[PDB]
Amino acid sequence: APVSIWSRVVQFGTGWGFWVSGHVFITAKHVAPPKGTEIFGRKPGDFTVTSSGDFLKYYFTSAVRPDIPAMVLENGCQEGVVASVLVKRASGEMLALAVRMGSQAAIKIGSAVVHGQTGMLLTGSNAKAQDLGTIPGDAGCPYVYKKGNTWVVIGVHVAATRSGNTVIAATHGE
């Protein structure tokens, strides 16, 4: 009966994004298509767009996906929480990566300080040797966890370190 969580993750621009609800879609700003692109067969004027750092939210005034009930969105989680990154690949593969969430920490470079949260993959020290870490292009995939019985989404993937153990999620509530 209930909608799979994976079905909320869809391809978008040069990465992916997540239906929080029937009206709300989120992604990483740096993978999105240009301002004024028709998306999901919608014109500009059918939606409003808000962004904090590399977090990007579309709100469609008329629901795009009535089938999908609203999920609690949060601005990160308590540190130490084990969340999952729901990574889809263009091959079709779906990889849920366990990640221990670190501290809310904000850096690309100086004078362009974007905000998010780090975590370490629980996939081990040699995640990229195993084809079990992320790649750029997984950007936009969601980070989620289960608080009690309730599911909640906390951010979207932006990047990983060279040796892929540390990952970075963009956050906010909007």
Residue numbers in the entry: 1 to 174
Authors' description from the paper:
To this end we extended an inactive MNV NS6 construct (which incorporates a C139A mutation to knock out the active site nucleophile) by adding residues from NS7, which is immediately downstream in the polyprotein.
MNV NS6 1′ crystallised in space group C2 with four molecules in the asymmetric unit. This structure is notable for the fact that, in contrast to the other three structures reported here and the structures previously reported for Norwalk virus NS6 protease, the electron density map was of sufficient quality in all four molecules of the asymmetric unit to permit the incorporation of the loop between the β-strands cII and dII. Superposition of the four copies of NS6 1′ indicates some structural variation in this loop—the Cα positions vary by 1–2 Å—consistent with the notion that it is rather flexible. In three of the molecules in the asymmetric unit the C-terminus is disordered beyond residue 173 (chains A and D) or residue 174 (chain C). Although the full C-termini of chains A, C and D of the NS6 1′ could not be modelled, the electron density map revealed additional features that could be built as short stretches of polypeptide. The C-terminus of Chain B of NS6 1′ beyond Gly 173 extends to make contacts with chain B from an adjacent asymmetric unit to which it is related by a two-fold symmetry axis.
